[PDB]
Short mmCIF file of all heavy atoms in Angstrom, two decimals:
data_model
loop_
_atom_site.label_atom_id
_atom_site.label_comp_id
_atom_site.label_asym_id
_atom_site.label_seq_id
_atom_site.Cartn_x
_atom_site.Cartn_y
_atom_site.Cartn_z
N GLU W 1 321.89 141.35 -72.54
CA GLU W 1 320.86 141.33 -73.47
C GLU W 1 319.83 142.52 -73.28
O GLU W 1 319.62 142.87 -72.10
CB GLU W 1 320.06 140.00 -73.48
CG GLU W 1 320.86 138.82 -74.13
CD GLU W 1 320.00 137.58 -74.11
OE1 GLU W 1 318.94 137.59 -73.57
OE2 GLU W 1 320.51 136.53 -74.75
N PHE W 2 319.23 143.02 -74.31
CA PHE W 2 318.37 144.15 -74.26
C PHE W 2 317.15 143.69 -73.59
O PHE W 2 316.56 142.59 -73.82
CB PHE W 2 318.09 144.64 -75.68
CG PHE W 2 316.99 145.68 -75.70
CD1 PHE W 2 317.34 146.96 -75.27
CD2 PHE W 2 315.74 145.46 -76.27
CE1 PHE W 2 316.36 147.93 -75.29
CE2 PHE W 2 314.77 146.46 -76.25
CZ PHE W 2 315.13 147.67 -75.87
N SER W 3 316.53 144.60 -72.65
CA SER W 3 315.28 144.27 -72.00
C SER W 3 314.34 145.41 -72.29
O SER W 3 314.70 146.56 -72.41
CB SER W 3 315.49 144.15 -70.48
OG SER W 3 315.90 145.50 -69.92
N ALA W 4 312.99 145.06 -72.26
CA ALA W 4 311.95 146.04 -72.50
C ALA W 4 311.56 146.77 -71.24
O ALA W 4 311.21 147.92 -71.31
CB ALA W 4 310.75 145.37 -73.16
N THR W 5 311.58 146.07 -70.11
CA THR W 5 311.17 146.66 -68.82
C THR W 5 312.14 147.75 -68.41
O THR W 5 313.35 147.63 -68.65
CB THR W 5 311.12 145.56 -67.79
OG1 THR W 5 310.25 144.47 -68.30
CG2 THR W 5 310.44 146.03 -66.49
N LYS W 6 311.64 148.79 -67.87
CA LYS W 6 312.32 150.06 -67.64
C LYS W 6 313.63 150.05 -66.82
O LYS W 6 314.72 149.90 -67.50
CB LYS W 6 311.34 151.13 -67.04
CG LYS W 6 310.42 150.46 -65.96
CD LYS W 6 309.36 151.50 -65.56
CE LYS W 6 309.83 152.53 -64.63
NZ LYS W 6 308.76 153.34 -64.08
N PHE W 7 313.57 149.96 -65.51
CA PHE W 7 314.71 149.86 -64.61
C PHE W 7 314.17 149.45 -63.17
O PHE W 7 313.38 150.18 -62.71
CB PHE W 7 315.57 151.01 -64.50
CG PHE W 7 316.62 151.20 -65.57
CD1 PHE W 7 316.47 152.18 -66.50
CD2 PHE W 7 317.62 150.25 -65.70
CE1 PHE W 7 317.45 152.33 -67.53
CE2 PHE W 7 318.61 150.37 -66.69
CZ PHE W 7 318.46 151.36 -67.60
N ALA W 8 314.64 148.43 -62.62
CA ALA W 8 314.46 148.00 -61.28
C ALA W 8 315.59 148.26 -60.28
O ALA W 8 315.56 147.74 -59.19
CB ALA W 8 313.95 146.58 -61.15
N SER W 9 316.55 149.02 -60.82
CA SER W 9 317.78 149.13 -60.00
C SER W 9 318.46 150.50 -60.39
O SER W 9 318.90 150.58 -61.58
CB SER W 9 318.77 147.93 -60.20
OG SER W 9 319.96 148.17 -59.48
N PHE W 10 318.53 151.38 -59.47
CA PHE W 10 319.32 152.61 -59.63
C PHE W 10 320.44 152.70 -58.65
O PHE W 10 320.42 151.95 -57.66
CB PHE W 10 318.41 153.85 -59.47
CG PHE W 10 317.42 154.00 -60.53
CD1 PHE W 10 316.09 153.68 -60.33
CD2 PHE W 10 317.83 154.50 -61.77
CE1 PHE W 10 315.16 153.83 -61.37
CE2 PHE W 10 316.86 154.70 -62.82
CZ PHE W 10 315.57 154.37 -62.55
N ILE W 11 321.28 153.63 -58.78
CA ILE W 11 322.29 153.94 -57.74
C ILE W 11 321.72 154.82 -56.68
O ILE W 11 321.13 155.93 -57.02
CB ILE W 11 323.54 154.64 -58.33
CG1 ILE W 11 324.23 153.59 -59.33
CG2 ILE W 11 324.50 155.03 -57.26
CD1 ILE W 11 325.36 154.24 -60.05
N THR W 12 321.74 154.37 -55.40
CA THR W 12 321.16 155.16 -54.32
C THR W 12 322.07 156.34 -54.11
O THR W 12 323.22 156.23 -53.87
CB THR W 12 321.19 154.24 -53.03
OG1 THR W 12 320.37 153.10 -53.29
CG2 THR W 12 320.41 155.06 -51.90
N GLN W 13 321.55 157.53 -54.20
CA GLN W 13 322.29 158.78 -54.00
C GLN W 13 321.35 159.91 -53.46
O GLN W 13 320.16 159.68 -53.34
CB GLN W 13 322.88 159.25 -55.36
CG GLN W 13 321.88 159.65 -56.40
CD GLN W 13 322.51 160.12 -57.65
OE1 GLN W 13 323.76 160.05 -57.80
NE2 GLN W 13 321.75 160.55 -58.62
N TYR W 14 322.09 160.92 -53.15
CA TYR W 14 321.39 162.10 -52.54
C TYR W 14 322.28 163.35 -52.85
O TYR W 14 323.44 163.16 -53.14
CB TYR W 14 321.12 161.88 -51.01
CG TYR W 14 322.29 162.07 -50.28
CD1 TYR W 14 322.68 163.22 -49.50
CD2 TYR W 14 323.23 160.93 -50.05
CE1 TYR W 14 323.76 163.29 -48.63
CE2 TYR W 14 324.34 161.01 -49.30
CZ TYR W 14 324.63 162.23 -48.63
OH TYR W 14 325.76 162.31 -47.84
N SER W 15 321.75 164.52 -52.70
CA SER W 15 322.43 165.71 -52.86
C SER W 15 322.59 166.53 -51.56
O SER W 15 321.89 166.21 -50.59
CB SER W 15 321.80 166.53 -54.00
OG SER W 15 321.85 165.84 -55.17
N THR W 16 323.41 167.55 -51.61
CA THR W 16 323.50 168.52 -50.58
C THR W 16 323.94 169.82 -51.22
O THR W 16 324.45 169.79 -52.38
CB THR W 16 324.36 168.00 -49.48
OG1 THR W 16 324.45 169.07 -48.43
CG2 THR W 16 325.67 167.57 -49.80
N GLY W 17 323.93 170.87 -50.48
CA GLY W 17 324.37 172.14 -51.04
C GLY W 17 323.70 173.23 -50.28
O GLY W 17 323.06 173.05 -49.28
N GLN W 18 323.94 174.48 -50.72
CA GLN W 18 323.47 175.67 -50.06
C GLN W 18 322.37 176.36 -50.91
O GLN W 18 322.31 176.21 -52.09
CB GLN W 18 324.51 176.66 -49.71
CG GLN W 18 325.33 176.21 -48.43
CD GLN W 18 326.28 175.22 -48.63
OE1 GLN W 18 326.20 174.10 -48.09
NE2 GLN W 18 327.38 175.47 -49.43
N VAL W 19 321.57 177.22 -50.25
CA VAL W 19 320.46 177.92 -50.91
C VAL W 19 320.21 179.28 -50.24
O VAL W 19 320.04 179.35 -48.96
CB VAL W 19 319.21 177.05 -50.90
CG1 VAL W 19 318.85 176.49 -49.53
CG2 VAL W 19 318.11 177.79 -51.50
N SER W 20 320.28 180.32 -51.05
CA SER W 20 320.10 181.65 -50.50
C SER W 20 318.81 182.27 -51.02
O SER W 20 318.48 182.24 -52.17
CB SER W 20 321.24 182.56 -51.01
OG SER W 20 322.51 182.24 -50.36
N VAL W 21 318.05 182.86 -50.03
CA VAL W 21 316.81 183.55 -50.37
C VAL W 21 316.92 184.93 -49.83
O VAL W 21 317.22 185.10 -48.59
CB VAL W 21 315.60 182.90 -49.73
CG1 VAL W 21 314.33 183.60 -50.16
CG2 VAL W 21 315.56 181.36 -50.20
N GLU W 22 316.70 185.96 -50.60
CA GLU W 22 316.96 187.37 -50.31
C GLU W 22 315.73 188.19 -50.61
O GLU W 22 315.58 188.61 -51.70
CB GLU W 22 318.21 187.84 -50.95
CG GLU W 22 318.65 189.32 -50.72
CD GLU W 22 319.90 189.65 -51.42
OE1 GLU W 22 320.44 188.70 -52.15
OE2 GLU W 22 320.42 190.76 -51.30
N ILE W 23 314.89 188.43 -49.68
CA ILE W 23 313.63 189.22 -49.87
C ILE W 23 313.87 190.58 -49.45
O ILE W 23 314.18 190.87 -48.27
CB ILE W 23 312.41 188.55 -49.19
CG1 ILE W 23 312.10 187.17 -49.73
CG2 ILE W 23 311.21 189.44 -49.34
CD1 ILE W 23 311.05 186.50 -49.04
N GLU W 24 313.62 191.58 -50.38
CA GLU W 24 313.62 192.97 -50.04
C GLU W 24 312.20 193.39 -49.68
O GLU W 24 311.31 193.14 -50.42
CB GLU W 24 314.08 193.77 -51.22
CG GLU W 24 313.81 195.22 -51.01
CD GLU W 24 314.15 196.07 -52.22
OE1 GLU W 24 314.64 195.45 -53.23
OE2 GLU W 24 313.87 197.28 -52.27
N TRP W 25 312.06 193.92 -48.52
CA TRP W 25 310.74 194.35 -47.87
C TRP W 25 310.63 195.83 -48.05
O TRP W 25 311.62 196.57 -48.23
CB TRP W 25 310.64 193.98 -46.48
CG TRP W 25 310.86 192.46 -46.30
CD1 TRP W 25 311.95 191.83 -46.06
CD2 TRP W 25 309.78 191.50 -46.14
NE1 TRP W 25 311.76 190.47 -45.92
CE2 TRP W 25 310.39 190.22 -45.90
CE3 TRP W 25 308.37 191.59 -46.26
CZ2 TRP W 25 309.65 189.09 -45.81
CZ3 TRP W 25 307.65 190.44 -46.13
CH2 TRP W 25 308.27 189.22 -45.93
N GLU W 26 309.34 196.27 -47.97
CA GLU W 26 309.09 197.75 -48.01
C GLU W 26 308.38 198.10 -46.75
O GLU W 26 307.21 197.72 -46.48
CB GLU W 26 308.28 198.15 -49.17
CG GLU W 26 308.10 199.70 -49.28
CD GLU W 26 307.15 200.12 -50.31
OE1 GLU W 26 306.51 199.28 -50.99
OE2 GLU W 26 307.00 201.35 -50.64
N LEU W 27 308.97 199.00 -45.91
CA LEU W 27 308.45 199.27 -44.58
C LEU W 27 307.63 200.59 -44.65
O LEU W 27 307.66 201.34 -45.55
CB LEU W 27 309.61 199.56 -43.65
CG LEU W 27 310.48 198.33 -43.45
CD1 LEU W 27 311.71 198.78 -42.63
CD2 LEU W 27 309.79 197.21 -42.78
N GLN W 28 306.79 200.60 -43.60
CA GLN W 28 305.88 201.85 -43.48
C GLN W 28 306.24 202.46 -42.17
O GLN W 28 305.77 201.98 -41.07
CB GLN W 28 304.39 201.46 -43.59
CG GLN W 28 303.49 202.57 -43.60
CD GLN W 28 301.99 202.22 -43.76
OE1 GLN W 28 301.71 201.02 -43.75
NE2 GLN W 28 301.10 203.19 -43.92
N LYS W 29 307.00 203.51 -42.21
CA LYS W 29 307.45 204.18 -40.97
C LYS W 29 306.21 204.88 -40.34
O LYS W 29 305.38 205.47 -41.00
CB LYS W 29 308.49 205.20 -41.32
CG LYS W 29 309.84 204.65 -41.87
CD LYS W 29 310.72 204.08 -40.75
CE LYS W 29 310.74 202.61 -40.78
NZ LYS W 29 311.66 201.98 -39.77
N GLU W 30 306.30 204.82 -39.03
CA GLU W 30 305.17 205.36 -38.30
C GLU W 30 305.14 206.89 -38.32
O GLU W 30 306.24 207.51 -38.44
CB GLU W 30 305.05 204.89 -36.88
CG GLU W 30 306.18 205.27 -35.98
CD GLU W 30 305.92 204.91 -34.49
OE1 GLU W 30 304.95 204.33 -34.24
OE2 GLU W 30 306.90 205.16 -33.73
N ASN W 31 303.96 207.51 -38.20
CA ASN W 31 303.78 208.93 -38.21
C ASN W 31 302.91 209.37 -37.10
O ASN W 31 301.94 210.12 -37.27
CB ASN W 31 303.21 209.35 -39.56
CG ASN W 31 303.35 210.79 -39.91
OD1 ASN W 31 304.00 211.59 -39.10
ND2 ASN W 31 302.82 211.18 -41.04
N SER W 32 303.28 208.90 -35.86
CA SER W 32 302.42 209.11 -34.78
C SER W 32 302.69 210.38 -34.03
O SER W 32 303.76 210.90 -34.02
CB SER W 32 302.55 207.91 -33.80
OG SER W 32 301.74 208.04 -32.64
N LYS W 33 301.61 210.94 -33.39
CA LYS W 33 301.70 212.02 -32.47
C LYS W 33 301.10 211.62 -31.07
O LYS W 33 300.57 212.47 -30.38
CB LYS W 33 300.98 213.25 -32.93
CG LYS W 33 301.59 213.80 -34.21
CD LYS W 33 302.92 214.42 -33.93
CE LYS W 33 302.72 215.79 -33.38
NZ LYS W 33 304.02 216.53 -33.23
#
């Protein structure tokens, strides 16, 4: 039967996977004497 109340029961689950972060930096080479 149809119910108005939202949901008191879900399927317990979780995810997994990989994640790549690739930051290009800009360097300041030294100019020392």
Side-chain angles (χ1 to χ4, degrees):
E1 286 183 353
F2 176 72
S3 68
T5 307
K6 40 186 283 187
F7 278 114
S9 179
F10 292 102
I11 295 173
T12 306
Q13 68 182 359
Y14 72 103
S15 297
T16 177
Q18 280 77 246
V19 54
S20 290
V21 184
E22 182 177 0
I23 295 178
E24 170 184 355
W25 301 88
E26 185 184 6
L27 297 175
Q28 188 179 5
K29 297 282 103 177
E30 66 173 357
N31 198 1
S32 181
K33 296 290 283 188

